[PDB]
A paper describes a structure:
To further explore this issue, we have conducted biochemical and crystallographic studies on the interactions of six GSTOs from [name] with chemical libraries. The six TvGSTOs (named TvGSTO1S to TvGSTO6S) used in this study are representatives of the twelve TvGSTOs that have a catalytic serine, while four others have a cysteine instead. In this study, we demonstrated at the biochemical and structural level that [name] GSTs that belong to the Omega class interact with polyphenolic compounds found in wood, and in particular with flavonoids such as dihydrowogonin and naringenin. The ability of TvGSTOs to bind polyphenols through different sites suggests that fungal GSTs could be involved in the transport of various polyphenols.
The structure of apo TvGSTO3S was determined by X-ray crystallography at a resolution of 1.35 Å. It has a typical GST fold where the N-terminal thioredoxin domain of one monomer cross-interacts with the C-terminal all-helical domain of the second one, and vice-versa. TvGSTO3S displays the highest sequence identity with Omega GSTs, though its closest structural homologs identified by PDBeFold23 are Tau GSTs. The N-terminal end of TvGSTO3S helix α1 harbors a serine as the catalytic residue instead of the cysteine found in the other GSTOs structurally characterized so far17,25. It enables efficient GSH-transferase activity towards usual synthetic substrates and disables reductase activity.
Numbering used by the authors:
A (entry chain A), B (entry chain B): 4 to 244
């Protein structure tokens, strides 16, 4: 019965995580776009003082999202939101019930956060060399069950945490968006198409085929256009060597 | 009933997290020290292919920790291990049961991970400026309940996640451990003693007063000596900005 409002932005993989989870949960919820990188509304720090998307309000009186209530719980940090949605909707089985399988999900989310995400950021925002990112992606790929399935076997929030980033990689590379050079772009495109990365390609197809992805993705071309609005992606700019 | 083995090192705040949680759970468990920074045993990648401490094995036959079994589950990443211990020992109430309070715990862990931990690492190991670390610590302090108590009210794994780092800060500063400049050491010592940080000092005292801390801490001087064994804490080197 308690309302959920998610403050979102199409470009944001962090917001995308939470939309996927809410879809998989069958939740009733509102989304409200915020132009966080270019024109943040003066009320936005009332929902998230960190001034980041996503933000979430929970409960309180039903109010317009641009008039947030002080009575709603304010929840920050996308991974905390994923665990919250799992806790709110236990019948949706957004995590396994077995402790070891649950730990596979948590480990996969930590491997992504601690080893992969920062490599994506370095390559895309600074144009650092692509090899350490490919190495990190090969490590993450090796944590998947080789013969098929999601991170913990059955789909879980671990897959919501990771697919937004992997799904953006392919179309962003095809558009040449990000500070890496053409040489490294070609290298990453060839690597991600090679047998070395067949398993992570299967993973991306499997996550993308679910309605939770279809219903929260604008389309590859539209997602690229939204990403070009991100100041830190510096459309038209590339660093070399 | 299944065995728990935690591969540990006294200097490591990451391993310390998990020891605290195991104590709070009342678990039966084995610890085994690993000289991971100077002399990693050849068998260690069998328990953690990432070659990091902590490592955990769960179940399988009872074997000496230096003879790990292929049959035990290998669990990596300290925050995944914290959630695993909470899942294995529900009667110990290592997380709240209320979803919003659980989300406070997960948010606190994410705030620490995403904003504070990298600042501690960069100030101590690279000598980067201390002001962003102090700003991150003030933000984390602001997430605590103002009147006392732990991150989510009652003690939870969020406090296990954070106290190893905060508890090391004070004696490390007094011993002059770290690559930051003298000026920044003075700044940090004065700040951490100032009224600005009264709330986090109370938090550290409250977490340290619990048996789970006392029984997993070697003593301030002993912890300082263990930290001096860390190669990246190069004695006699300082960076200046
Ligand atoms: Ca506050």
């Amino acid at each position: 019965t308690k309302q959920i409002t998610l403050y979102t932005a199409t470009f944001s993989p962090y917001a995308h995580r939470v939309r996927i989870a809410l879809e998989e949960a069958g939740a009733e919820y509102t989304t409200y776009d915020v132009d966080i990188l270019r024109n943040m509304p003066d009320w936005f720090p009332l929902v998230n003082p960190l001034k980041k998307i996503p933000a979430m309000t929970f409960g309180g009186p039903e109010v317009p999202p641009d008039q947030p209530s002080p009575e709603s719980a304010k929840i920050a940090e996308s991974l905390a939101m994923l665990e919250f949605i799992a806790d709110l909707f236990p019948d949706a089985k957004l995590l396994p019930t077995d402790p070891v399988l649950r730990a596979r999900a948590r480990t996969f989310m930590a491997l992504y956060e601690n080893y992969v995400n920062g490599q994506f950021r370095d390559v895309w925002f600074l144009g650092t060399p692509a090899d350490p990112l490919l190495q990190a992606l090969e490590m993450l790929q090796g944590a998947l069950p080789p013969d098929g399935g999601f991170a913990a076997g059955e789909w879980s929030i671990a897959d919501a945490a990771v697919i937004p980033f992997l799904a953006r990689m392919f179309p962003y590379l095809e558009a040449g968006l990000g500070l890496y050079s053409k040489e490294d772009g070609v290298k990453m495109r060839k690597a991600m198409a090679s047998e070395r990365f067949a398993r992570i390609r299967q993973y991306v197809r499997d996550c993308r085929a679910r309605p939770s992805f279809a219903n929260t993705w604008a389309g590859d071309a539209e997602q690229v256009e939204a990403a070009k609005t991100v100041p830190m992606l510096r459309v038209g700019e590339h660093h070399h060597h």
